[PDB]
Symmetry: none
Subunit: 216 residues, 2 copies
């Protein structure tokens, strides 16, 4: 669907001042009031910032928001461990006239050298194609902090549906690891010219492409 | 949070029928339309119904809604195991002059069936080897419950060194997915006859095998 864009991750060293930005449009962010939440897995969308600029209750003087055009930003001014959570922004869309959401940002209290993903994409193998099935995999490893955004395109038009993306987990090296896969029909696969995976990580945006090649 | 009053939980079993309630005031539910969202801990809410009764694109017929008077009801007919998430109502508020959000309701699918994992083993891509590098991926998807035990074997013995295994995460269908990889020299790769990935899901075990190359 069409959402409000936010980086996968934002972060810095303790005490440091970080800020999660969030971009929308003409019809939402820049016409309505951005609301900001703190989420984390285990029922808790705790509202943080209402009416753009205003702080909820039990809301640390540490947080404050803004709003330029079609953009808004939440800056946590004094990074504490208690901050590493998911942050979400939301605005009303008078065009769709439904509440439009941010894709979330994870703030990590950066305890180690930032590292970018090593994106390795794989096409379906033969004894899989031989089995009438074709699955692609975007191994994503050696990265920190542990939050990435993955998109898949099939001929340049991006595939939304069928993509499954693991949740990063600290490897043996302390660095993170994730995989995202797409399940196709051997026809569905040999019915495109190229298949690309696209991981974005704090600033870096790698991307791999693939295309069918074997006794076709 | 707390504003558009929803039952805090609802329980079912695959195939029942559940109805999430949604209670307002005249200035919101009474007067504007109700919108419903589905939330998957760590995703970003996806629109489920709009204009009180209409389905966003790609929403099952299992879902229907109604604005009773000042309250609205979302109903899951033939309840499924991927229906297990949080649900939210929303409405514009005439006086407050803002969008009011529901307190949330989380469904539970009482006893999902056991599902044994799909193992897909993958050999180094030509193009990963085209740069002297070989990684092996055992993808292990659509399994339930979530615990697995992966094991590598290079020529029937436990090539257990250079292997990272993800911690299982719950996908879009409330069925897990995990994936493990083996990283070896393009030599070390070709240095074997068979490389097998082994998965023990609940006393069961499927082992998949891969041999260095073939097919023109």
């Amino acid at each position: 669907q069409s959402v409000l864009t936010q980086p996968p991750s934002a972060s810095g060293t303790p005490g440091q001042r970080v800020t999660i930005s969030c971009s929308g449009s003409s019809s939402n962010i820049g016409e309505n009031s951005v609301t900001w939440y703190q989420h984390l897995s285990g029922t808790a969308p705790k509202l943080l910032i209402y009416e753009d600029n205003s702080r909820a209750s039990g809301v640390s003087d540490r947080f404050s928001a803004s709003k330029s055009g079609t953009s808004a930003s939440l800056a946590i001014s004094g990074l504490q461990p208690e901050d590493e959570t998911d942050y979400y922004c939301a605005a009303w869309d008078d065009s769709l006239d439904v509440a439009v959401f941010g894709t979330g940002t994870k703030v990590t209290v950066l305890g180690q050298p930032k590292a970018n993903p090593t994106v390795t994409l794989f096409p379906p193998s033969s004894e899989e194609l031989q089995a009438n099935k074709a699955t692609l995999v975007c191994l994503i490893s050696d990265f920190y902090p542990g939050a990435v955004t993955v998109a898949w395109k099939a001929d340049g038009s991006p595939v939304k549906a069928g993509v499954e993306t693991t949740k990063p987990s600290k490897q043996s090296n302390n660095k993170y690891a994730a995989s995202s896969y797409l399940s196709l029909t051997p026809e569905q696969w040999k019915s495109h010219r190229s298949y690309s995976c696209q991981v974005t990580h704090e600033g870096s945006t790698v991307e791999k492409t693939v295309a069918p090649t074997e006794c076709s």
